[PDB]
Amino acid sequence: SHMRILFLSYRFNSLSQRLYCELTEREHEVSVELDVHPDLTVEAAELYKPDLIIAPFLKRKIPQEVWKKYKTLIIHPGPPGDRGPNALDWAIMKGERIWGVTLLEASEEYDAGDVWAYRTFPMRFARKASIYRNEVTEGVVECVLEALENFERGDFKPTPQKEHWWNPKMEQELRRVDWEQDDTKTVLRKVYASDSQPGASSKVLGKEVLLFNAYPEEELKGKPGEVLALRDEAVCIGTRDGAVWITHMRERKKESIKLPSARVLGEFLKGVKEDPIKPWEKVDFKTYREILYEEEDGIGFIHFNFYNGAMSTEQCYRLLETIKYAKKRPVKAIVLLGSEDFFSNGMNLNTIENAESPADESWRNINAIDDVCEEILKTPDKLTVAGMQGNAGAGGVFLALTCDLVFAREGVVLNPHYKNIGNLYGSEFWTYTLPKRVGWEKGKEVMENRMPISSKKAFEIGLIDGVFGKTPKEFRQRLKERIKNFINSKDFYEFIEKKKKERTSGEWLEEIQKCREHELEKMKLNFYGFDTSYHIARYYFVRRKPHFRTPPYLAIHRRLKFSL
Ligand SMILES: CC(C)(COP(=O)(O)OP(=O)(O)OC[C@H]1O[C@@H](n2cnc3c(N)ncnc32)[C@H](O)[C@@H]1OP(=O)(O)O)[C@@H](O)C(=O)NCCC(=O)NCCS
Numbered sequence: 001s002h003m004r005i006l007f008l009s010y011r012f013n014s015l016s017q018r019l020y021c022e023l024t025e026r027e028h029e030v031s032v033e034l035d036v037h038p039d040l041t042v043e044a045a046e047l048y049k050p051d052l053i054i055a056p057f058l059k060r061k062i063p064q065e066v067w068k069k070y071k072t073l074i075i076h077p078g079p080p081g082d083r084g085p086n087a088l089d090w091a092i093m094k095g096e097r098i099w100g101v102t103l104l105e106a107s108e109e110y111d112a113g114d115v116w117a118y119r120t121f122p123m124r125f126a127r128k129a130s131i132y133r134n135e136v137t138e139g140v141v142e143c144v145l146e147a148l149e150n151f152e153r154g155d156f157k158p159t160p161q162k163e164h165w166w167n168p169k170m171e172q173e174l175r176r177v178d179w180e181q182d183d184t185k186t187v188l189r190k191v192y193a194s195d196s197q198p199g200a201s202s203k204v205l206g207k208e209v210l211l212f213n214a215y216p217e218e219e220l221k222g223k224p225g226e227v228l229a230l231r232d233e234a235v236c237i238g239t240r241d242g243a244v245w246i247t248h249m250r251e252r253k254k255e256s257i258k259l260p261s262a263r264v265l266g267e268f269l270k271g272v273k274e275d276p277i278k279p280w281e282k283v284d285f286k287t288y289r290e291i292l293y294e295e296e297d298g299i300g301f302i303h304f305n306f307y308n309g310a311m312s313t314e315q316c317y318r319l320l321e322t323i324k325y326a327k328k329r330p331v332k333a334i335v336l337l338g339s340e341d342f343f344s345n346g347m348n349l350n351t352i353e354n355a356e357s358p359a360d361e362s363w364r365n366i367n368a369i370d371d372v373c374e375e376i377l378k379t380p381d382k383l384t385v386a387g388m389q390g391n392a393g394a395g396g397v398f399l400a401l402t403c404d405l406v407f408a409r410e411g412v413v414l415n416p417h418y419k420n421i422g423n424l425y426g427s428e429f430w431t432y433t434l435p436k437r438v439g440w441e442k443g444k445e446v447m448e449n450r451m452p453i454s455s456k457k458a459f460e461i462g463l464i465d466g467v468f469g470k471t472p473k474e475f476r477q478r479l480k481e482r483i484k485n486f487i488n489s490k491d492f493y494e495f496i497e498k499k500k501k502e503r504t505s506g507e508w509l510e511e512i513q514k515c516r517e518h519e520l521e522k523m524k525l526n527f528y529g530f531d532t533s534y535h536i537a538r539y540y541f542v543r544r545k546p547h548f549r550t551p552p553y554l555a556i557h558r559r560l561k562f563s564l
């Protein structure tokens with residue numbers, strides 16, 4: 001089995017990238033045609049002539065010319081019989097206790113085809129994006145692998161649907177948060193169902209907005225719709241029975257972008273008081289904690305729940321503060337855990353795009369990230385560990401590589417390159433860390449590859465030190481146990497004595513400083529040089545500008561010397 005597989009995807013999104021990894025790392029070939037026009041889709045099928053078509057993420061109908069000619073399998077993020085374009089939204093709004101995913105054949109009627117495979121799972125009360133990125137994506141991977149085995153077997157017959165139902169596109173009126181009528185549980189459900197798109201509409205301080213990234217608040221109380229506090233740019237708003245934090249909003253205008261709530265509401269918030277909670281404090285009630293520091297068994301764990309993995313200048317400085325605190329604690333190891341869904345996606349391109357000078361903000365942001373990285377590297381007397389529970393891209397990957405040890409959950413997808421953001425040179429001391437791990441030649445290959453790689457592939461090529469665990473929680477438990485065993489071994493004290501000698505030597509310190517200087521001179525050129533590739537790419541990314549063709553790096557069937 002060395003199949004030629006065509007993906008049809010509206011966007012080469014997290015699910016499409018995970019499946020690309022699983023299939024190519026099994027030596028199948030995967031070409032991608034983006035969903036631009038049915039005529040383009042027909043052309044791509046005739047050009048590539050796939051053994052099999054998989055549609056991981058598709059907003060419109062595959063033309064009959066295609067799927068009547070090539071076996072076409074379609075991902076649906078609901079259990080068998082569920083039909084419609086907003087399966088997860090409805091599941092969350094209705095409070096389903098069980099959900100699932102289905103791999104079904106293309107047919108004329110939407111989501112009506114025979115079932116090739118499916119998986120079910122218990123629902124979490126959580127954002128739609130988190131369910132999509134965890135339960136749904138893991139379940140779809142098992143379905144596609146099972147279908148591949150069925151396909152190459154040759155005698156598989158799919159199971160036609162029996163019971164079924166249709167849920168239409170969900171209207172905003174259903175998502176709209178009414179602070180006076182909605183208790184906290186209802187506000188969470190609506191925001192969760194609409195996160196990360198299209199957001200739950202609401203009015204806040206008289207502004208029509210879309211709400212994102214909600215968290216319950218049990219201590220602060222007030223009037224429904226009253227802003228009770230600010231905390232790391234999230235706002236806390238009274239509900240019918242309590243209060244909810246909203247960390248991000250978007251104004252309901254065509255060109256607006258998702259930003260920290262404080263930046264969207266602006267002067268409307270004048271007078272609200274910051275209610276700070278340091279990451280290392282203990283509290284007994286539910287509240288919003290962007291960064292959390294906890295110590296167990298001689299290990300200091302730093303969770304940083306930065307929305308979408310995007311690290312603003314100010315979030316970097318808050319993370320830096322917590323790393324400095326941890327370096328002063330009696331721990332043997334410091335573990336950077338990111339969040340369950342992302343380790344890090346590097347600089348925050350939205351707060352950059354929103355600044356008066358995106359170039360100056362990029363410069364602020366890359367220096368802030370490098371300060372975090374430098375603080376990590378210059379930790380002579382403690383083990384540092386990156387635990388990648390979730391995906392990482394661009395600078396977020398190289399952030400992890402500054403730690404002594406990098407581990408990742410099974411199924412994490414890595415994008416250790418800058419080809420989507422205008423071929424940035426990158427920093428985070430990659431010119432020091434990457435050759436140490438894989439050599440200069442391989443490291444340059446890694447950064448020239450625009451396609452994703454899995455954590456398994458990253459481990460096999462030496463980019464990271466291990467991969468284990470299927471869920472974030474299992475990964476965290478295995479990580480703690482692995483680090484605990486190490487710091488309680490004789491090997492740890494020998495390693496630390498060596499690291500003390502290396503990381504306090506003038507030779508080492510001057511080397512890493514030169515690496516930062518060289519990287520930042522190159523990023524300066526990216527940010528400020530006459531060539532504005534970086535700013536153009538950031539604009540397309542942040543504004544989600546459509547494609548009018550599939551680039552040849554995705555479409556094998558559209559490269560220059562493509563034959564047969
Ligand atoms: C890493 C990457 C390839 C992953 O692709 P993917 O799995 O399809 O994930 P998405 O692009 O859909 O990201 C999910 C969300 O996080 C956003 N996001 C990801 N990285 C971001 C970043 N650095 N800054 C701001 N937003 C980011 C995306 O806009 C998207 O937003 P939305 O769901 O609110 O609509 C892609 O997210 C990416 O290129 N991010 C930018 C990394 C970067 O260039 N950082 C700056 C240089 S250090």
Ligand SMILES: Nc1nc2c(c(=O)[nH]1)N[C@@H](CNc1ccc(C(=O)N[C@@H](CCC(=O)O)C(=O)O)cc1)CN2
Binds near residue numbers: 062
């Ligand atoms: N051949 C064929 N093509 C398909 C599917 C199929 O089974 N058969 N299933 C699709 C995946 N699931 C859906 C289900 C419903 C809708 C849908 O309802 N679209 C509305 C617009 C809704 C929107 O705004 O997104 C329309 O009028 O086209 C879109 C994708 C992929 N395209």
